């Protein structure tokens, strides 16, 4: 059973604003003991954000952001959320959630990561969309 991190809630908020992520592991599929959340840019590697594991606390966050971004594991409909409140104008990129196991190191392995779901902060502006 590999980690196939379905995400989801990828859009455009203004800066200040709050976007919640929600990653849907295979419909509903557990083999993750360790996970993430990473940042991803055009000519930018994806860097730490957050990280959730099988219990223990799993809780990250920048001091930038500090509080605001906060970050759930349920598995029991196998979904992991990162609830971003107040995003800043240059968190205009692609986000991706992160999967694996522990290693007996004691280090942390992202084995697998996200499809990449595109979130744009708008300075303080929106866009409409007719069909």
């Known amino acids: 059973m590999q980690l196939q991190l379905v995400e989801s809630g990828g859009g455009l908020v203004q800066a200040g604003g709050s976007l919640r992520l929600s990653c849907v592991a295979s419909?509903?599929?557990?083999?993750?003991?360790?996970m993430g959340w990473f940042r991803q840019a055009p000519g930018k590697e994806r860097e730490f954000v957050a990280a959730i594991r099988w219990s223990g606390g799993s809780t990250y966050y920048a001091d930038s952001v500090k509080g605001r971004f906060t970050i759930s594991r349920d598995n029991a409909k196998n979904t992991v959320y990162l609830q971003m409140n107040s995003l800043k104008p240059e968190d205009t990129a692609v986000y991706l959630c992160?999967?694996?196991?522990?290693?007996?190191?004691?280090?942390?392995?992202?084995?697998?990561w996200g499809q990449g779901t595109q979130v744009t902060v708008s300075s303080l502006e929106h866009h409409h969309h007719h069909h």
């Open positions: 992160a999967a694996g196991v522990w290693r007996s190191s004691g280090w942390d392995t992202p084995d697998y």
């Open positions: 419909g509903r599929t557990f083999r993750s003991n360790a």
